[PDB]
Amino acid sequence: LTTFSLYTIIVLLVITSLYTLTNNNNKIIGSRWLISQEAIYDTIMNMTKGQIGGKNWGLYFPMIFTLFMFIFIANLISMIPYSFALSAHLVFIISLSIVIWLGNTILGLYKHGWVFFSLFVPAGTPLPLVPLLVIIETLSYFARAISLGLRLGSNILAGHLLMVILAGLTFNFMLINLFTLVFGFVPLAMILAIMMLEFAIGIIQGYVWAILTASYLKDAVYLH
Amino acid sequence: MLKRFPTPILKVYWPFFVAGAAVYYGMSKAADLSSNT
Amino acid sequence: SAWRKAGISYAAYLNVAAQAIRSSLKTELQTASVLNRSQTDAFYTQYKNGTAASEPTPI
Amino acid sequence: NDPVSSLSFEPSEKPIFNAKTIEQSPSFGKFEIDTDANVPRDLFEYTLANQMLT
Amino acid sequence: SSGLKLQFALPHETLYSGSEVTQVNLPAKSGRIGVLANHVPTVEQLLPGVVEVMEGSNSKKFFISGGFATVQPDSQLCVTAIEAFPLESFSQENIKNLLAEAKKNVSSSDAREAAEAAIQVEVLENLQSVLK
Amino acid sequence: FYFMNQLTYGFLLMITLLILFSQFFLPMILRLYVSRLFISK
Amino acid sequence: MQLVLAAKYIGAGISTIGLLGAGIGIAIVFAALINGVSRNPSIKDTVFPMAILGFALSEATGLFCLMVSFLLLF
Amino acid sequence: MQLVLAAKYIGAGISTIGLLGAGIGIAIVFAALINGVSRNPSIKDTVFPMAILGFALSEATGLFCLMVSFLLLF
Amino acid sequence: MQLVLAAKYIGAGISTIGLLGAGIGIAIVFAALINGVSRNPSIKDTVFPMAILGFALSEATGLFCLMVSFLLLF
Amino acid sequence: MQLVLAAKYIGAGISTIGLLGAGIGIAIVFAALINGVSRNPSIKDTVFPMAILGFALSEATGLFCLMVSFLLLFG
Amino acid sequence: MQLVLAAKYIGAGISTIGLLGAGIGIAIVFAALINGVSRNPSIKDTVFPMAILGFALSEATGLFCLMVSFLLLF
Amino acid sequence: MQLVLAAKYIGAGISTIGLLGAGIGIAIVFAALINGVSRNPSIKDTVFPMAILGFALSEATGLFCLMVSFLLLF
Amino acid sequence: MQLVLAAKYIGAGISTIGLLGAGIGIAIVFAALINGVSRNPSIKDTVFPMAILGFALSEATGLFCLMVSFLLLF
């Protein structure tokens, strides 16, 4: 039982005790908890129409939802100064990006086969421009997949360390100054600001990850 | 409430699952190759 | 200022500006024409074919 | 009614382009409009006033 | 065309019907633009201001009550106006100030009426600028 | 390095969430939809 | 060897300086999309995918800078 | 050889800066494209191709810079 | 000897930065081209040849930078 | 004897970046030319020679720095 | 005396960065000039003299930078 | 003093970049001048002395860079 | 003092760069002033002192950079 695995168990303990453990009013309302997830559920459902809609948007809806839930929960409890968040390695976020891309192509290669190679040439770019575009398009396909995984994990690592580095400075300030007042609450004020940012960025980057993985699904199912 | 109305669970979600399996085979050998223990 | 949302339309704004020029025009410029421009005795009835008769609303 | 002669007259028509379509004029490009002054709707209202008065 | 022709007209009587002009000032919503020959076709809203008709005889000025300054590619300047400012006889400070003070009381009467009242005060202040 | 009980377990987690959502609360949201739909009629 | 690794580090750092343009570029792309939706709200659905396309291209530039930096590192 | 490879790494790191210009350029092209398409929906069909090609070889300029960095590395 | 080669490499790397101006310029040329053709579609035929001419001129400035970098290297 | 040529190469390389501004300035002149031609198709005869003059003038401005780099190299 | 002369080479090379500002200044004055002439065909006779004067004033900085670079060289 | 003289030369070369900003600033001032006179030709007389003052103030930065470079050299 | 004086000289040379920002400050303040006065003559009287304060503070920042560069010299 590594730190990753025990954290993953804590994730599911929280997951069930928001909507699965209310289940009593037999209505659409009756608990503000229910309003919370269906708000998120509706934001992604209409987003599923707006990005994947047209033949099978609802077919692939859960993966975007489950991944968004996975990133959302993993980013909620990540601020406490002793948060050894996701083992301080975050290597799986890269792995999630790799498997998401790798599954994306097999779906593309299964549903299109050789036609999947025609995606590198959207509208024009004739034979003189074909090798340049297919190089840019194919390298890009590797490019944003690896970038997606690294950006989320590094910023979580960056946010966690800027918790500690600033915290050590506050310890230095509150120990040296005898009678003055403006030495520690201002560094505490930045700590309050920099923690709100880390909490905020995790919410949108989960959304950004949700939008991005949605965006790549369009390219696999729909050729343009 | 939890009344199970059947929905696609595995019928259309196979490609990412087989992609995951293809990852797994090799995913453990990468650690074995780069053991460094 | 704002005459589309705060006001009514460009027509009303222009009419109010014209009334500004006319009413604030100097005494020797005042004549019968500016009196006719100031004069307005229209009545908006808005016939209630279905409903909503305005009943001779003054201009 | 058009007062074509000093004694003769007949009805005649003058159509007013909507603000939603004055911007779709084929020659609309040659005018350097500005989006700040919302020129189409003001033009439409002024057009309606002038032609109805005439 | 040779120079510029101005169709400056007022509903009581037209002021110009294509008279040759050396230069025209057109205070607009954005700003005054000098059109005197050829130029490019334009459509623009005339904000209340001094539309001074510069000519070889003299640079006579007119404060407009509003209108549209539009240009045609054949060097045509169609300026539709309502009430002009003939020379300087239009100037009358006392009644302008009286209207401004008496009706700024009703500048907050009723939405549309209040906005029109504020606009009329603004154009009265424009006249005051023209009053000199 | 360590991947055994997390990535396979991650897809199993996605399957469990898939069940507890699409078989439980998607029918719940749909059921309230159609319930009020027939309430009107 | 020590100078080789030192220059590797400085080359990676000076390779990092090429992605400010990528950030500014994705930003001006999204800004132009905001402007266009302001002018033409109806065309938003048609015009949005090109925003993500340009974002992906500029991010590709930035991660080309990343590739140079990382190959200079490890 | 130590200084030679050191400065090769430094030169590659400096050379990869062209992606900054490539991204900024493709992004200004995209910005103008979006502005024009929102201002003129009808122009989209006949303004797509040369815009695509233009930002393509604007990226090719940064690719040339990256290739210079590559030859400096190797 | 080796110092000369090292400075040659660093000078070529610094010279590679000259392509940024070429990229930004060619892209702003196509940006103005897009805006103009979106304004009036009729102008595109009379602007395209001279447009690509100015495009190739900025590309030639970039190629001059690249050629100076190359003759530094070789 | 080696440091002098090393600094010659360094100075030439850091001088080559001058053509960056010349090229982008040429192209922004050209962009404004495009904008003016689009907003006035009848002004092309007046605007083309002046824009070409600005082109060649900015080009000469860049080429003088290019000559400075060349004299750093071979002189 | 090789190090002082090497550093004056480096300084003369550095001094040639003001070309960017000089060229962009010529560029912007001529760009606004051409825009004003196109939008106002009847303003040339009074904008051209001040446009040339502003161009000369902008080129003053560039020529002075090249003069100080030359005096550093010789 | 030998390395001091070399650093004097390199520092003067570094300090000579302010004329770039001085020229680009006076040129943007002139561009605003000519755009404004294209819009309103009547304000030319009013804007002439204010713009000359602005030109002098902008070139003051280049003059300060000159005096710094002169202090570095002599 | 050899290295110390060398670093002081190069530090003054690099600190000279704040005049770039001071000049751009004064320049676009004056440019916006020109645009506003050419678009509205009456507002010139009330916008002139604001621009005065603006470039005064910009030149104050430039003077701060000049002071910091000067202390590295003497």
UniProtKB/Swiss-Prot annotation, chain A:
Gene Ontology annotations of biological process type: proton motive force-driven ATP synthesis
Result after altering residue 142 to I: In strain: D273-10B/A1
Gene3D superfamilies per UniProt: ATP synthase, F0 complex, subunit A (1.20.120.220)
TM annotation in the entry: 1-21, 57-77, 90-110, 115-135, 156-176, 181-201
Sorted UniProt keywords: ATP synthesis, CF(0), Hydrogen ion transport, Ion transport, Membrane, Mitochondrion, Mitochondrion inner membrane, Transmembrane, Transmembrane helix, Transport
The UniProt record lists the keyword Transmembrane helix: yes
Location within or outside the cell: Mitochondrion inner membrane
Domain of life according to the entry: Eukaryota
Bilayer topology annotation: Multi-pass membrane protein
Quaternary state and interactors: F-type ATPases have 2 components, CF(1) - the catalytic core - and CF(0) - the membrane proton channel. In yeast, the dimeric form of ATP synthase consists of 17 polypeptides: alpha, beta, gamma, delta, epsilon, 4 (B), 5 (OSCP), 6 (A), 8, 9 (C), d, E (Tim11), f, g, h, i/j and k.
Family listed: Belongs to the ATPase A chain family.
Name of the protein: ATP synthase subunit a
Organism: Saccharomyces cerevisiae (strain ATCC 204508 / S288c) (Baker's yeast)
Lineage: Eukaryota, Fungi, Dikarya, Ascomycota, Saccharomycotina
Annotated gene: ATP6
From Swiss-Prot, chain C:
CDD domains listed in its UniProt record: F1-ATPase_epsilon
Transmembrane is among the record's keywords: no
Function, as annotated: Mitochondrial membrane ATP synthase (F(1)F(0) ATP synthase or Complex V) produces ATP from ADP in the presence of a proton gradient across the membrane which is generated by electron transport complexes of the respiratory chain. F-type ATPases consist of two structural domains, F(1) - containing the extramembraneous catalytic core, and F(0) - containing the membrane proton channel, linked together by a central stalk and a peripheral stalk. During catalysis, ATP synthesis in the catalytic domain of F(1) is coupled via a rotary mechanism of the central stalk subunits to proton translocation.
GO molecular function, one term: proton-transporting ATP synthase activity, rotational mechanism
InterPro entries referenced in this protein's UniProt entry, alphabetically: ATP_synth_F1_esu_mt (IPR006721), ATP_synth_F1_esu_sf_mt (IPR036742)
Localization, UniProt: Mitochondrion; Mitochondrion inner membrane
Organism of derivation: Saccharomyces cerevisiae (strain ATCC 204508 / S288c)
Subunit relationships: F-type ATPases have 2 components, CF(1) - the catalytic core - and CF(0) - the membrane proton channel. CF(1) has five subunits: alpha(3), beta(3), gamma(1), delta(1), epsilon(1). CF(0) has three main subunits: a, b and c.
Keywords: ATP synthesis, CF(1), Hydrogen ion transport, Ion transport, Membrane, Mitochondrion, Mitochondrion inner membrane, Phosphoprotein, Transport
Name of this chain's protein: ATP synthase subunit epsilon, mitochondrial
UniProt keyword annotation of Manganese present: no
From Swiss-Prot, chain D:
TM annotation in the entry: none
Effect on the protein upon substituting residue 8 to I: In strain: D273-10B/A1
Cellular compartment(s): Mitochondrion; Mitochondrion inner membrane
General function of this protein: Mitochondrial membrane ATP synthase (F(1)F(0) ATP synthase or Complex V) produces ATP from ADP in the presence of a proton gradient across the membrane which is generated by electron transport complexes of the respiratory chain. F-type ATPases consist of two structural domains, F(1) - containing the extramembraneous catalytic core, and F(0) - containing the membrane proton channel, linked together by a central stalk and a peripheral stalk. During catalysis, ATP synthesis in the catalytic domain of F(1) is coupled via a rotary mechanism of the central stalk subunits to proton translocation.
Anything else known: Present with 28100 molecules/cell in log phase SD medium.
Family per record: Belongs to the ATPase gamma chain family.
Subunit structure, interactors included: F-type ATPases have 2 components, CF(1) - the catalytic core - and CF(0) - the membrane proton channel. CF(1) has five subunits: alpha(3), beta(3), gamma(1), delta(1), epsilon(1). CF(0) has three main subunits: a, b and c.
Protein name: ATP synthase subunit gamma, mitochondrial
Organism: Saccharomyces cerevisiae (strain ATCC 204508 / S288c)
Gene this protein is translated from: ATP3
Curated annotation (Swiss-Prot), chain E:
Keywords from the UniProt entry: ATP synthesis, CF(1), Hydrogen ion transport, Ion transport, Membrane, Mitochondrion, Mitochondrion inner membrane, Transit peptide, Transport
Subcellular location: Mitochondrion; Mitochondrion inner membrane
Superkingdom, natural source: Eukaryota
GO molecular function: proton-transporting ATP synthase activity, rotational mechanism
An individual GO BP term: proton motive force-driven ATP synthesis
One CC-aspect GO term: proton-transporting ATP synthase complex
Main location: mitochondrion
Quaternary structure note: F-type ATPases have 2 components, CF(1) - the catalytic core - and CF(0) - the membrane proton channel. CF(1) has five subunits: alpha(3), beta(3), gamma(1), delta(1), epsilon(1). CF(0) has three main subunits: a, b and c.
Role played: Mitochondrial membrane ATP synthase (F(1)F(0) ATP synthase or Complex V) produces ATP from ADP in the presence of a proton gradient across the membrane which is generated by electron transport complexes of the respiratory chain. F-type ATPases consist of two structural domains, F(1) - containing the extramembraneous catalytic core, and F(0) - containing the membrane proton channel, linked together by a central stalk and a peripheral stalk. During catalysis, ATP turnover in the catalytic domain of F(1) is coupled via a rotary mechanism of the central stalk subunits to proton translocation.
Similarity comment text for this entry: Belongs to the ATPase epsilon chain family.
